[PDB]
């Protein structure tokens, strides 16, 4: 199956063929009550004490529990969970390029970042969110240091000479209408 | 920062004033270490370390959650091959004096986001602007040259101060003087 | 826009990456938000600590 | 009398904001409702609803 999926662009073998082959099944919450889930195929292996020997299904990848905005977070399993919730809010407030055809649009408010970068550290879910193609930020060299005290209590010091070179520069468009 | 670490820019220093590594890298952003320990956003530190490996190696680092093949020790070992201290610290020099800083500083590439919240959309001030037709008190909001509300809790605060003349000014002379 | 290629969408000044899934009313882009409701045709039994019925079964 | 907020202006601040707005779900409990129970992360959301993405206000 994987070897057929790896040439999906040539053989026209698809996700639909994978469901039609009886390999993948759609399961609802009410049917999950009756299902026995392996978190990975490593749960299917023989073990020195067997927790369960009668699994019915396996997860594809555990990270699919996340939604769009939470999927942008790298290493979210190493954060206290409210901080993942706050990122899931603030990622919707980040400037980027919001859509490619923005030049024809007359949105009342629009922010466009000059130099979006894709992140150097990415989840694999970010491929499907097109974040690689409409990114909303810049990879910044960050030092974690006290220095002169102007960064205390959730504040940051920026390099003015980087800002002169266009770091985090943006354009703001406001549209007016009259008849 | 993608890890719920938000802040406002407190000051900007030019490149000669920022701290520098022995090779002349200055941070783009300095963030305070007191942001970390109660937030436990360790994913931020691992992102920084992985990003430092990523930029040296020339590969986009995988930070997908639940990947047992990636851990802090493996990232540290990869970093040690590029001639850096394995935990991401570097010796920084003070930009003002040139002296080495006694503590070595954790430094590396971290993805940052500019949020739509900018100070020039928020700054406001009023003195004797327009008033509402019905109650003749100051208008509401920046976009109307409005006055800030001196509320009941502020009233109670000035009562507890005993500031009877200032309370009179704010609840009469500065709002709706009439005869 | 259905079935159009990226080139056809660009010729119409549309964005290939735009997902659709929204309406345009008076020029404003309007999205419908999914509404949770209790499922129909199912017997649920509930109880409450402070009412004149011991148990209620609703369909 | 009609239920409000079922249609909203599509958020266009950034592409993630657009995608997430198209995938939004609402529980019509009412923003002022003080009961914690429908706001808790129920176990059965596993793989159905994102555990992290919720607005940190009254909603």
């Amino acid at each position: 199956h994987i070897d057929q999926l790896k040439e999906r662009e040539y053989n026209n073998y698809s996700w639909q063929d994978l469901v039609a082959s009886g390999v993948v099944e759609y399961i609802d919450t009410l049917e999950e009550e009756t299902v026995m889930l392996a978190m990975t195929p490593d749960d299917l292996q023989e073990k020195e004490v067997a927790y369960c020997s009668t699994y019915t299904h396996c997860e594809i990848h555990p990270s699919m529990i996340l939604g769009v905005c939470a999927s942008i977070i790298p290493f979210p399993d190493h954060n206290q969970s409210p901080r993942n919730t706050y990122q899931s809010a603030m990622g919707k407030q980040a400037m980027g390029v919001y859509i490619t055809n923005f030049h024809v649009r007359m949105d009342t408010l629009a922010h466009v970042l000059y130099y979006p970068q894709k992140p150097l550290v990415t989840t694999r879910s970010m491929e499907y969110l097109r974040f690689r193609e409409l990114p909303a930020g810049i990879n910044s060299i960050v030092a974690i240091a006290s220095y002169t005290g102007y960064n205390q209590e959730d504040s940051v010091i920026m390099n003015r000479s980087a800002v002169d070179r266009g770091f985090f520069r943006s354009v703001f468009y406001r549209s007016y209408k009259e008849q | 920062s993608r890890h719920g670490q938000k802040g406002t820019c407190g000051i900007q220093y030019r490149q000669e004033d920022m701290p520098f590594t022995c090779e002349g890298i200055t941070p783009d952003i300095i963030i305070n270490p007191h942001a970390i320990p109660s937030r436990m956003t360790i994913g931020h530190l691992i992102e920084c370390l992985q990003g430092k490996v990523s930029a040296n190696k020339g590969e986009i680092g995988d930070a997908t959650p639940f990947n047992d093949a990636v851990n802090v020790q493996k990232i540290s070992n990869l970093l040690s091959d590029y001639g850096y201290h394995l935990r991401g610290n570097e010796v920084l020099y003070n930009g003002f004096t040139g002296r080495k800083i006694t503590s070595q500083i954790f430094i590396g590439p971290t993805y940052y986001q500019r949020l739509k919240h900018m100070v020039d959309d928020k700054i406001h001030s009023r003195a004797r602007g327009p008033i509402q037709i019905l109650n003749r008190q100051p208008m509401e909001g920046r976009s109307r040259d409005g006055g800030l509300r001196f509320g009941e809790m502020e009233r109670d605060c000035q009562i507890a101060h005993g500031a009877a003349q200032f309370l009179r000014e704010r609840l009469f002379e500065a709002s709706d003087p009439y005869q | 826009l259905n079935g159009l290629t990226d080139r056809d969408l660009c010729e119409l000044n549309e964005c290939p990456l735009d997902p659709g899934g929204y309406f345009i009313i008076n020029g404003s882009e309007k999205v419908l938000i999914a509404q949770e409701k209790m499922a129909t045709n199912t017997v649920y039994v509930f109880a409450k600590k402070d009412s004149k019925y011991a148990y209620t079964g609703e369909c | 009398q009609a239920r409000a907020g079922v249609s909203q202006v599509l958020n266009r601040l950034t592409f993630a904001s657009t995608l997430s707005h198209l995938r939004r779900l609402n529980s019509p409990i009412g923003r002022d409702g003080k009961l914690a129970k429908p706001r808790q992360l129920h176990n059965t959301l596993w793989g159905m609803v994102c555990p992290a993405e919720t607005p940190e206000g009254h909603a």
Partner: peptide, 29 residues
């Protein structure tokens, strides 16, 4: 033809990619 643990991480992301190539993100709308 069992997928061994060394192949599993590429295999499951091939599967997920095939899903998103088919369905996309707004399929339910």
């Amino acid at each position: 033809d069992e997928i061994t643990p060394d192949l599993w991480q590429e295999a499951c992301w091939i599967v997920i990619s095939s899903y998103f190539d088919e369905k996309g993100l707004v399929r339910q709308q």
